[PDB]
Amino acid sequence: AKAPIRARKRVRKQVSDGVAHIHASFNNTIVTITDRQGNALGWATAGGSGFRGSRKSTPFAAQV
RNA sequence: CUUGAGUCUCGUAGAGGGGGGUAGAAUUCCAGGUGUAGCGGUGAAAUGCGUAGAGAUCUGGAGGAAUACCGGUGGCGAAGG
């Protein structure tokens, strides 16, 4: 063993495939990637990107 | 008398009515797994929902109300329908 790399050479799972489920809501948009059996692996939102109801509800907030 | 009106047979369309029964789907709501700090609401957000484990996604469970399409100036009703 040498001293370790500056950016990772490896990654701890490799399940390859999933589903992005989007709930594009009337006030927001919520995006969650889930494994193929529907157990959610991680998520993020429009509204948490510094937006209230009034801006989180847009395709640009959803894009983020 | 049969012509107005009345009567049965018989062909027949129908969201007509009353009584009871019913299927699938949905609006709603919860838990928990997975996940992790977000969710929700407008004109503005606040009010409201969370982090004490939500929202979202999967799976389990709960209630009460109503039938999208079809569909027509159509068909039916004593009218309200």
- Give me A9's structure tokens: 């050479």
In this structure, how many other beta carbons lie within 10 angstroms of the beta carbon of residue A39?
Answer: 7
Resolution (A): 13.2
- Method by which the model was determined: cryo-EM
Which residue in this structure is represented by tokens 């959803």?
A: A62
- Give me A22's structure tokens: 């989007």
Protein CA at A37 to nucleotide C1' at B66, angstroms:
33
Protein CA at A3 to nucleotide C1' at B15, angstroms:
81
The length of chain A is 64
CB A48 within 8 A of CB A29: no
CB A56 within 8 A of CB A39: no
Strand B protein footprint, C-beta under 7 A: A 21-23, 25-28, 30, 32, 34-35, 37-48, 52-57
First to last CA, chain A: 40
CA A23 – CA A62 distance, rounded (Å):
10
Protein CA at A47 to nucleotide C1' at B4, angstroms:
81
